Amino acid sequence: ANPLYQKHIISINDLSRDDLNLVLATAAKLKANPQPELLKHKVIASCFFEASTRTRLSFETSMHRLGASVVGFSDSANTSLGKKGETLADTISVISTYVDAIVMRHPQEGAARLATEFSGNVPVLNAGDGSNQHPTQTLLDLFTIQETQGRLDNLHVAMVGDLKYGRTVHSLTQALAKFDGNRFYFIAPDALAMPQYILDMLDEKGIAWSLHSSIEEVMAEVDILYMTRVQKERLDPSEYANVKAQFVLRASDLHNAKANMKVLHPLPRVDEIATDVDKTPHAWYFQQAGNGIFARQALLALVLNRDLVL
Amino acid sequence: ANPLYQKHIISINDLSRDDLNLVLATAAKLKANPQPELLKHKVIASCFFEASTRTRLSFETSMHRLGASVVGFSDSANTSLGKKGETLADTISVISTYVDAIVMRHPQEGAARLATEFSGNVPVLNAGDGSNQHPTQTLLDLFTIQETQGRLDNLHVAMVGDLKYGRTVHSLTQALAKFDGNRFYFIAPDALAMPQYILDMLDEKGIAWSLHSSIEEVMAEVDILYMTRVQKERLDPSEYANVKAQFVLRASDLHNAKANMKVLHPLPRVDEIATDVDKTPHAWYFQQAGNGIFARQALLALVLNRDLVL
Amino acid sequence: ANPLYQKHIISINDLSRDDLNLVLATAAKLKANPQPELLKHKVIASCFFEASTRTRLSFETSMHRLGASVVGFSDSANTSLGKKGETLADTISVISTYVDAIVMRHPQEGAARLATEFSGNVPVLNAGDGSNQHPTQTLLDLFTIQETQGRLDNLHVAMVGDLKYGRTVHSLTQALAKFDGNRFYFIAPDALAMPQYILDMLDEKGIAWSLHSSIEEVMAEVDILYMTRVQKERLDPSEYANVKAQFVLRASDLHNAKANMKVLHPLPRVDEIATDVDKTPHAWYFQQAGNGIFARQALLALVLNRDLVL
Amino acid sequence: ANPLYQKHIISINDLSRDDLNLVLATAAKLKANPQPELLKHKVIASCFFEASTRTRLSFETSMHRLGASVVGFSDSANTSLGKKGETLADTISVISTYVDAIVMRHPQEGAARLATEFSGNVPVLNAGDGSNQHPTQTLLDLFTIQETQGRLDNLHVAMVGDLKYGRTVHSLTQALAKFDGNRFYFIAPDALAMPQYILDMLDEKGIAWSLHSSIEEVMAEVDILYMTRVQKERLDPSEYANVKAQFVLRASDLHNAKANMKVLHPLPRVDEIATDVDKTPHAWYFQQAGNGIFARQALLALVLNRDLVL
Amino acid sequence: MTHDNKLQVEAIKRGTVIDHIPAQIGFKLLSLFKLTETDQRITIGLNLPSGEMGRKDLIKIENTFLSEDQVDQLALYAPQATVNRIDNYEVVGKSRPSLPERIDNVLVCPNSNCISHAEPVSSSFAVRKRANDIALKCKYCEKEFSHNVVLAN
Amino acid sequence: MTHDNKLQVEAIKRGTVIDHIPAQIGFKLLSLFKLTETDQRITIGLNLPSGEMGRKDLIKIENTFLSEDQVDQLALYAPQATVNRIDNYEVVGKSRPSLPERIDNVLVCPNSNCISHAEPVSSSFAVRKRANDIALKCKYCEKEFSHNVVLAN
Numbered sequence A, B, C, D: 001a002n003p004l005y006q007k008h009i010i011s012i013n014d015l016s017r018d019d020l021n022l023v024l025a026t027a028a029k030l031k032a033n034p035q036p037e038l039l040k041h042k043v044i045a046s047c048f049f050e051a052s053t054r055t056r057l058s059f060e061t062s063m064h065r066l067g068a069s070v071v072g073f074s075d076s077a078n079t080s081l082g083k084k085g086e087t088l089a090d091t092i093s094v095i096s097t098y099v100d101a102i103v104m105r106h107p108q109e110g111a112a113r114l115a116t117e118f119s120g121n122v123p124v125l126n127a128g129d130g131s132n133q134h135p136t137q138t139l140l141d142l143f144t145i146q147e148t149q150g151r152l153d154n155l156h157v158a159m160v161g162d163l164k165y166g167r168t169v170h171s172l173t174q175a176l177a178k179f180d181g182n183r184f185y186f187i188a189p190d191a192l193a194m195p196q197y198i199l200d201m202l203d204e205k206g207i208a209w210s211l212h213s214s215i216e217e218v219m220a221e222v223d224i225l226y227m228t229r230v231q232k233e234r235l236d237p238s239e240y241a242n243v244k245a246q247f248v249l250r251a252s253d254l255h256n257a258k259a260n261m262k263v264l265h266p267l268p269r270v271d272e273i274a275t276d277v278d279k280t281p282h283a284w285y286f287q288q289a290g291n292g293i294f295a296r297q298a299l300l301a302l303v304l305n306r307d308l309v310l
Numbered sequence E, F: 001m002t003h004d005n006k007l008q009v010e011a012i013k014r015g016t017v018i019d020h021i022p023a024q025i026g027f028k029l030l031s032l033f034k035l036t037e038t039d040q041r042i043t044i045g046l047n048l049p050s051g052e053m054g055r056k057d058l059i060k061i062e063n064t065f066l067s068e069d070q071v072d073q074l075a076l077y078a079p080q081a082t083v084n085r086i087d088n089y090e091v092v093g094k095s096r097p098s099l100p101e102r103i104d105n106v107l108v109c110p111n112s113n114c115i116s117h118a119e120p121v122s123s124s125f126a127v128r129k130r131a132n133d134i135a136l137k138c139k140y141c142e143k144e145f146s147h148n149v150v151l152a153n
């Protein structure tokens, strides 16, 4: 039985280096030879209590490319659950009575972990729980750093944007700190800075980081430039605009970028990465999203299969 | 050809004792040996004109566990039908032009029976029509009484809660009256009493029933205790609370319950069955819901198959 | 000062027989010799946290016929106050520094009594609080009964419809039971019957009451027929539609009524009173609604003015 | 004519120290010897394109206590004007042919200044324009500070809460900085701090200010404590909940305040001021809201009347 | 000081002893009527042996004399208690709870739409009809409920 | 005997005695740790004299041995209580509270979006002495807070 067999993938803090390597090697193999009937006869629930299309269509195509059936709902705009006080413990106690794995997104933090106390032995995979975790977005980001850079250690990774409330930059910094010699450069408006609990964790492990005010200061040394969208209401219209809107990447800024540097963005991008970056060899944001299929397929294959054929 | 072959399952009053036995024996067999490609190549429509998640996810997982494809919608929150005066006769005359069975829920009573005048030879299975019928909830309740109690006759069945407007207690009392020697105990607030047409039907068949005011009066003799949610607006807040809220079950009340007694609840349960009942051996409400998969699979297998392999 | 000067008008339970007659006496004088500058310079607040435009227009026209100013709001799905966060207690604490009196209708019971504790010396008049009280409807009903019948004692009053949840039928019975010799007939569907508290009070005072099944069996002996709306939601479509040959009133039913018998209805009257009743002499619901003006003028005049010499 | 006769009242930045005192002087006279027919025959327009019922009722009661007429509207999710298509400029161009003055609150900044260019000789008074200005809140705050403290100079004012986005705290600092010798203490969470423009202005005028971390460290030296709402959306639930042992005020915190120290809050005060503060002498937020009446009476009297001899 | 023991402990000087409290009501009363937010020594005995009730609870609060209507607020919970008032080691006074005409703060209006829930007002109920079983009326929604219903939640 | 302390109070034969509960923690601990839900004799003392340590509280619970795990809970509240077991008229063990590994059940997540607020779940926090304080990390939202923010609530 592989380590992940029938585990709940709730948080990145629960996965080890070894665990992260296994998922990443399996994504690589399914990307190279498809296994389209591996989950034949499995039925998986896609419970999106909060809508997220990008994430849902990607998780369900992954389920479909391994042969599984999907049943489920996308709510936020009504699909009758919690109708007449029905708790989440009770919804999951009824859904686990007939599906083989639950994929779920939910607006409150902790919800996927609570599902786990009621699902029996149906594994629960977290597709986002409020401002807390989103591991399957970190698995795909990791897979893309690894496939383009060849390694996960000894990287120079710049994180640009809203680092205070970007739930994905916080998880990728904790994942990347599992590995050696990475160096972090944070470039954020003052109001949108990387929290102390992250910085304090990096320090305690001996990992090097530094703050910079523009990308030009560090373009030269950078391998992965991971951008985040500033959400325009985390600042007021005049603040967003007034001089903090210069965390915007354009093609011209890329001149001195190393030959291997890649620009990653969990998406939607709206302002921050100008359209002309797309034609460059360094734009890897959409190829990052396509790698979501393999990272996601790998987790469903390792969780539902005792042993893997390869 | 089995009797149910290509019938419309609209009402419990249309199914005989024999019909009920057949479905129940087939559910038992599919529960014991799966037949996951029996409905291979069938496409079934899941039309929920009124949303019901619990019921939809269960009917579609059942379709998926026999190999069928599903297409369909869940509305109440818009999905364009009846847009610009399109009648239900016309929607069903177009949907039956390409699916092999229609499963439908609808807010008006009679709707599934009307679908039947327009579907041609595509069978129509009713998943709820307003305050009228819901046979597939009665088939699963029956299957659970049968699988835990070993029989469907000679039972002591207590029905507790809102018996006036609970569409499922009314159908289970008519199903159970098809069988012999059952004894009914009704325990309801005065405002939420079991209607006369039910009582009059029971009398005319020589079946014994009695009203009680608390569960303690009859716990001892009881085999199946079927609870219903009082809907808090069928009474006003002060009525619900003022002394009628004592149709609430807790673990302590179970002391003298027979070793075989089971507590069933179509769900959502909110107040009426305290959480501590869950740890008891008598709590069977969630295992009741999982049996919905087999009852529901059995109906689709008998309706779409001339002959059954077993 | 007059007995009611600067008093809060919240429940009918709190006004003695004598306060009820004071009000009705004043309202007969303002109807006869109107005084349009009596509240000159006062500012009344019409805070309808729940919309009722009919009750709001009656009241605001009452304020303006006595020359007062009006500020306020209504709130079907809208405007800021009591916010959720902002308490009713703080809304009132703020508004009672601006105005001279507060008329308020709120959806929760006792909201007007809560206000009383926060309005300082500003009087608060209840225009409806959940299912508890509506004293200004009872005051105009009594004025219409005193004005058509000549007295408020020794009446044969029939009350019909939803006696279980009509707030106006509960209040009217408390108030007519402060005068002497009144005989009450209650014709309700037995699912919508007089609560036992009204009936238990009536028996402690020795008052005569009886319950009947259709208006046809009391028509003959009756002076006031107070029709009430039967509230379709807490009723099944089919239940609603099943009751006898109904409890609606038509003119052919009136062919026996005494010549001084009047039909009253708080309005709206969707169904229960047919259009042909409007042309009979017994029809008085519209005239009852004009008397709303003189009952509420009276109350504001006595509350805000030390002594009236009209 | 008085200095303010027929002037537009849009920003605090535009009223000299002397205009601020004229207004506060008038408002103390109208509070003492009220003149209820002063604007007899004038018609004011209360155009709230953004609902604030509290500010609307204060203003409309102000209009009515000086005898004026009122036409207008509010607009949470509703009524026609400024339509989208219909410009604000054309709304105003049309309304300034009907009325004698316009009080307006709009969601976008400078909406009131735009109006000024289209209202002809009709004065427009700003009741709030996005996050820019609210001069009539600052005028009543100053009246409450002058009325409790005796002067507007040489005050030890503490400002607490969301100093970065409270529009009222930004205005109050501009206005108190036209009088002399004022010392300012700003106790804010450092993510919600005074913007550098307020602070840069205060240093060009030589004014003393300091920043503190909890009210407990200034309690002793302070005259006005201006609490502000901390705005939960631009804050993480967990951030919101993390700050020290908080910045809310309770009476045990007040056990050291000077006897003439008053707590002011523009309201609503959901959380930051506990109920027990309401019974202390230092509580003045409700009294501050009654003074809204006399500050806005003053402004309308001076704007619409050539000279006041009260 | 006098030779205490614990199957019935002894002498406080000056104060209140509420004795003959039913089993398991003693802590309810401590919590509910906030008897503990004092600086005086309190001695409490729980599940003790006694004069026939068999097992009882007892509370001793020195220097506090809670009385007349405080004692009456104890009647739904501990109606057969005795509130000895002690001064200079002598029981200078024994009373029992009579049923009060009003119970404030301690109860919760069972009516979900009542306004009391949401706000800076404390509960208040009018009480009526002794021993054959009590009805309580919310001050605010004026809805009358059975005491056994208010006393569950 | 005299310099008062005892004058007949409660020496017990088998049980746990929690002494030096720092004043006011005493009633917290009964509520929170559900100590009165027992039929055994409890005798409690509040605002008990302590020239021996300012002023304190003391619970004596007999025929019950509340230990190991149960003792470490109390550390967040009564950091220096010394628990004493007794099986025959005197101290058989005198255990101090050490800080635990997890604090279950009694504590609320500060985070209002945490799912622990709406659901049938028991609170659980991971304890971490970050010298200057103890941080507490919620098992559900995984949000870390100082113990002071959590204990306020």
Ligand SMILES: Nc1ccn([C@@H]2O[C@H](COP(=O)(O)OP(=O)(O)OP(=O)(O)O)[C@@H](O)[C@H]2O)c(=O)n1
Pocket (backbone or CB within 6 Å): E008, E009, E010, E011, E012, E013, E014, E017, E019, E060, E082, E084, E086, E088, E089, E090, E091, E094
């Ligand atoms: N200075 C004193 C004197 C008496 N007690 C308490 O007073 C209570 C009862 O008073 P008392 O009349 O002295 O004993 P009883 O006659 O048993 O009173 P009752 O029969 O009403 O229980 C006893 O429980 C005892 O603990 C006390 O604590 N301190």
Ligand SMILES: Nc1ccn([C@@H]2O[C@H](COP(=O)(O)OP(=O)(O)OP(=O)(O)O)[C@@H](O)[C@H]2O)c(=O)n1
Pocket (backbone or CB within 6 Å): F010, F011, F012, F013, F017, F019, F020, F060, F082, F084, F086, F088, F089, F090, F091, F094
């Ligand atoms: N049969 C006994 C023996 C002891 N005790 C209690 O057990 C506690 C244990 O304290 P002890 O070691 O006997 O002496 P102390 O010096 O008071 O302990 P500490 O270091 O906490 O002051 C005392 O408070 C005493 O009340 C008891 O109730 N019954």
Ligand SMILES: [Zn+2]
Pocket (backbone or CB within 6 Å): C110, E109, E110, E111, E114, E115, E116, E138, E139, E140, E141, E142, E143
């Ligand atoms: Zn109430």
Ligand SMILES: [Zn+2]
Pocket (backbone or CB within 6 Å): A110, F109, F110, F111, F114, F115, F116, F138, F139, F140, F141, F142, F143
């Ligand atoms: Zn949490």
